[PDB]
Amino acid sequence: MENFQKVEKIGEGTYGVVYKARNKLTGEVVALKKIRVPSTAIREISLLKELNHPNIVKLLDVIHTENKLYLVFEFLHQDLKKFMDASALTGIPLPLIKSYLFQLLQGLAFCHSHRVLHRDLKPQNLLINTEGAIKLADFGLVVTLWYRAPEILLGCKYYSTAVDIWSLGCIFAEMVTRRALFPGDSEIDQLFRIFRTLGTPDEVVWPGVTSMPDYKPSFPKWARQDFSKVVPPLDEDGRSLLSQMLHYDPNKRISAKAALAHPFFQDVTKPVPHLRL
């Protein structure tokens, strides 16, 4: 760790803190996460090092010394959140939204084929570069609930890769409308905001829902809203794909692999964004 000079504090979480740092040796500029421990986690992390893909932020090295764990990541220059904020008055052009969505589905298809889940996708841990790339970061092993799948909120303990598809659907929506799709400030408000838009789930659309740990018969019954009202600007191919990413039933929810074959992506390209760094 003496091999690193911290340049500036990049992020703070409930696990650790992230710094932009320079390797006094390699010369490289990297993102250094200071985790503040389980041997099983040492092996869990050791496995993430092999999980290498163009759309996953590279774990360059793992450094375990004393009562600290440091993870050295590939550095990227901006997060999607900042880019969304910066594009808020014009909106991200559709071709770029499509490219980012496609690339993220590629990243997820990869992860998921290795039975790895992200669990906590959000704009803040999606990182972009000048080349038009977007990458998955901050894999999960005040907390924002806005992107949480309904099965998680209802207490499902052994949830699936489908949770990441739900999160990405919410992010897709957000890029298109320039507003959070489900901005809840508590678990129940998150759940109820979902219900109010997509309708209160029942056994018809989601077999087994009523026997989930935190499901309550006393949940209010709201009707599903018209989808054309939810992401207006978006064309029918986009809305179609979104609806399949936001299916209640995790087993009906589209896979990353299947989503990549959706008609929406027939004309996909790779624009370059204009980044102000």
Ligand SMILES: CN1CCN(c2cccc3nc(-c4n[nH]c5cc(-c6ccc(N)cc6)ccc45)[nH]c23)CC1
């Ligand atoms: C809230 N945001 C976060 C992003 N922040 C940020 C701003 C500007 C440039 C940034 N570059 C990063 C970054 N590069 N590489 C990373 C790797 C992880 C990582 C961490 C954990 C894992 N597991 C994998 C990768 C997290 C963050 C980064 N983050 C940046 C701005 C504030």
